[PDB]
Design an enzyme around this catalytic site. Structure first.
Site, PDB file in Angstrom:
ATOM      1  N   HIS A   1     -23.830  -2.496  19.846  1.00  0.00           N
ATOM      2  CA  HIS A   1     -23.253  -3.839  19.920  1.00  0.00           C
ATOM      3  C   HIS A   1     -22.395  -4.175  18.704  1.00  0.00           C
ATOM      4  O   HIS A   1     -21.852  -5.286  18.636  1.00  0.00           O
ATOM      5  CB  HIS A   1     -24.345  -4.900  20.123  1.00  0.00           C
ATOM      6  CG  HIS A   1     -25.250  -5.104  18.949  1.00  0.00           C
ATOM      7  ND1 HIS A   1     -24.785  -5.369  17.679  1.00  0.00           N
ATOM      8  CD2 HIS A   1     -26.602  -5.125  18.866  1.00  0.00           C
ATOM      9  CE1 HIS A   1     -25.811  -5.521  16.860  1.00  0.00           C
ATOM     10  NE2 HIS A   1     -26.925  -5.378  17.554  1.00  0.00           N
TER      11      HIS A   1
ATOM     12  N   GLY B   1     -27.145  -9.734  10.767  1.00  0.00           N
ATOM     13  CA  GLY B   1     -26.653  -8.581  10.047  1.00  0.00           C
ATOM     14  C   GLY B   1     -27.697  -7.553   9.688  1.00  0.00           C
ATOM     15  O   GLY B   1     -27.372  -6.588   8.988  1.00  0.00           O
TER      16      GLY B   1
ATOM     17  N   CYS C   1     -29.403  -5.822  12.001  1.00  0.00           N
ATOM     18  CA  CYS C   1     -29.293  -4.759  13.000  1.00  0.00           C
ATOM     19  C   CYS C   1     -28.790  -3.470  12.363  1.00  0.00           C
ATOM     20  O   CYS C   1     -27.862  -3.485  11.555  1.00  0.00           O
ATOM     21  CB  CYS C   1     -28.379  -5.180  14.156  1.00  0.00           C
ATOM     22  SG  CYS C   1     -28.719  -6.889  14.648  1.00  0.00           S
TER      23      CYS C   1
HETATM   24  C1  LIG Z   1     -24.437 -17.706  21.505  1.00  0.00           C
HETATM   25  C2  LIG Z   1     -23.802 -17.685  20.131  1.00  0.00           C
HETATM   26  C3  LIG Z   1     -24.073 -18.966  19.369  1.00  0.00           C
HETATM   27  N1  LIG Z   1     -24.283 -16.524  19.379  1.00  0.00           N
HETATM   28  C4  LIG Z   1     -24.472 -16.519  18.059  1.00  0.00           C
HETATM   29  O1  LIG Z   1     -23.897 -17.275  17.276  1.00  0.00           O
HETATM   30  C5  LIG Z   1     -25.475 -15.510  17.558  1.00  0.00           C
HETATM   31  C6  LIG Z   1     -26.118 -14.671  18.452  1.00  0.00           C
HETATM   32  C7  LIG Z   1     -27.032 -13.756  17.963  1.00  0.00           C
HETATM   33  C8  LIG Z   1     -27.287 -13.697  16.599  1.00  0.00           C
HETATM   34  C9  LIG Z   1     -28.226 -12.769  16.036  1.00  0.00           C
HETATM   35  C10 LIG Z   1     -29.054 -12.051  15.559  1.00  0.00           C
HETATM   36  C11 LIG Z   1     -30.093 -11.222  15.016  1.00  0.00           C
HETATM   37  C12 LIG Z   1     -30.294  -9.928  15.479  1.00  0.00           C
HETATM   38  C13 LIG Z   1     -31.310  -9.167  14.923  1.00  0.00           C
HETATM   39  N2  LIG Z   1     -32.122  -9.605  13.957  1.00  0.00           N
HETATM   40  C14 LIG Z   1     -31.921 -10.851  13.520  1.00  0.00           C
HETATM   41  C15 LIG Z   1     -30.932 -11.689  14.011  1.00  0.00           C
HETATM   42  C16 LIG Z   1     -26.586 -14.590  15.777  1.00  0.00           C
HETATM   43  N3  LIG Z   1     -25.698 -15.479  16.240  1.00  0.00           N
END
Ligand SMILES: CC(C)NC(=O)c1ccc(C#Cc2ccncc2)cn1
Ligand SMILES: CC(C)NC(=O)c1ccc(C#Cc2ccncc2)cn1
Ligand SMILES: [Cl-]
Lengths: 306, 306
Positions: B41, B143, B145
């Site tokens: 991703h 971040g 990941c």
């Molecule tokens: C819909 C839209 C508002 N999406 C976002 O902004 C958005 C989506 C996903 C993440 C994340 C993450 C994460 C992954 C693994 N470990 C910790 C955190 C951050 N931001």
């Protein structure tokens, strides 16, 4: 999200761990620049530990008596001296993996990461706190002495603890890297008991802020309190007195969450008087006091180290 | 003495962590030999994550689109391919710090150490367990990941987990190093909920043996039970069924402490039916299930890694 007991990356300290052997005693040493630091009881036998005279025991020791080994290579000792309760073994080779480092004497309540070693080889890493009674609740077995506790900020390793003794009650005592014991403990196998294990109030509050940040809010109440009134409850439950300094230190967390510090104190007060009622906070059924306000901010913001 | 949640030394894994940037997305990658592994991703934007077609998105990506950085030096990507849910970025420089390693798919209940990273730089290390519902209770922020979970035996790093997603409930999901997710989770921001978070019975029993070894024996009772009768209680409290394999695995601990496995089961039964009564076990007010029989033996015997 998620809050976990988190130690610093140990790679920088692994490269400084060596094995020190003196006679029939083997323990770990810290190899920084051209000096190896280790507990001075390396020169003691098992019978010597009841009542050692370290100055006299060291007279029978020369440079070549101290066997220092890193991996399968053996360091040449060109000098040695005793500083408080540690020995400084001057070697002829500067550790090529010496990180930027400092020697820091932490205060009670501060936290650090422990790299438990045996025969100079790392075994594991975990997070500890200097208890108010100047002990630590670690995991140490025979031969772990020499294992160090440390903090890391960006690229500088702040060494603050060296493991020395295990008390009859299962807790652990040690020194700073200058050889001065934390608390009133001595490197003697005598009757020395730990004091009251008070709880680090400011750390419980920081941990409760971390719970709010991560979704656990059931413990939030509708009350507030004053520092004095709360401290009346803290005394009852053997909690360290909260000071205005502690309040100021929690400022950044108070601002991020919008919960006044004294409001959180009132929530803690209810938890101390009424318990958890079988509930949990960040996966714990008791109040965690080994996270500093500094740890919470660092883990919740993602501070890295290079 | 003393029992603590203990992660492996992370030095060997720190040297394999790099930063992978694709467009406006940055995450961590694992640099082993001349290949960098990262979550696929990385090639997605924030809007792409709702319903990505990874095969189509990757068509618009070339080798030079993948920016791999280690420290302040930048790796040259000479090839790339998608394997399940990870990308394999072939670089032109073999990582000089590649440790001996394996790719292992762990089973539910097994434990591993997580090195949380951000922008390819380590932030901390903690111990995790693959939950029976194939999630993990970690500490991950935006971040993170690319951060990997691993085990170490002597000199071989067994990589078993790569971090990918955080579910709406705060738990975490990821893949093995071959890109196959643990559990039924996908690298899509869709409605996927975790199943029942069952407790790892065999791990609670190992942890209770560790408590006995370290002085906590109040929970020992005068009763015994059978695997079937105990499992009737385990079902009620959402505990994984105990099997004869689990019994055999606890054999070494049973022999060291002289407490039959089914005797310990009966003690656990009372704890599940009557609670802790405000007491603690190894400093915990709840039953810990993220120590394997293997972890207990290793920490209680001082196994090292070189
Ligand atoms: C819909 C839209 C508002 N999406 C976002 O902004 C958005 C989506 C996903 C993440 C994340 C993450 C994460 C992954 C693994 N470990 C910790 C955190 C951050 N931001
Ligand atoms: C009286 C006589 C029987 N002494 C002994 O055998 C004896 C004394 C002390 C120790 C020890 C230790 C230790 C230190 C730091 N961390 C963990 C463990 C082992 N053995
Ligand atoms: Cl707990």
């Amino acid at each position: 999200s998620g809050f976990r007991k988190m130690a610093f990356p140990s790679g920088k300290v692994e490269g400084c761990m060596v094995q020190v052997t003196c006679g029939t005693t083997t323990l770990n040493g810290l190899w920084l620049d051209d000096v190896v630091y280790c507990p001075r009881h390396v020169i003691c036998t098992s019978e010597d530990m009841l009542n050692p005279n370290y100055e006299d025991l060291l007279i029978r020791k020369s440079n070549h008596n101290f066997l220092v080994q890193a991996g399968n290579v053996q360091l040449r000792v060109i000098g040695h001296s005793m500083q408080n309760c540690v020995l400084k073994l001057k070697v002829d080779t500067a550790n090529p993996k010496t990180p930027k480092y400092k020697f820091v004497r932490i205060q009670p309540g501060q936290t650090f990461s422990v790299l438990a070693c045996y025969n100079g080889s790392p075994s594991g890493v975990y997070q500890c706190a200097m208890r108010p009674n100047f002990t630590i609740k670690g995991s140490f077995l025979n031969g772990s002495c020499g294992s160090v506790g440390f903090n890391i900020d960006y690229d500088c390793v702040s060494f603050c603890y060296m493991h020395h003794m295990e008390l009859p009650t299962g807790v652990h005592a040690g020194t700073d890297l200058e050889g001065n014991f934390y608390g009133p403990f001595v490197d003697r196998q005598t009757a020395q008991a730990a004091g009251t294990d008070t709880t680090i109030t400011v750390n419980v509050l920081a941990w409760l802020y971390a719970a709010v940040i991560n979704g656990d809010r059931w413990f939030l109440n509708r009350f507030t309190t004053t520092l004095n009134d709360f401290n009346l409850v803290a005394m009852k439950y053997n909690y360290e007195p909260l000071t205005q300094d502690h309040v100021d230190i929690l400022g950044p967390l108070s601002a991020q969450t919008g919960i006044a510090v004294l409001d959180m104190c009132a929530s803690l007060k209810e938890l101390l008087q009424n318990g958890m009622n079988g509930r949990t906070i960040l996966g714990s059924a008791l109040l965690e006091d080994e996270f500093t306000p500094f740890d919470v901010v660092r883990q919740c913001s993602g501070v890295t180290f290079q």
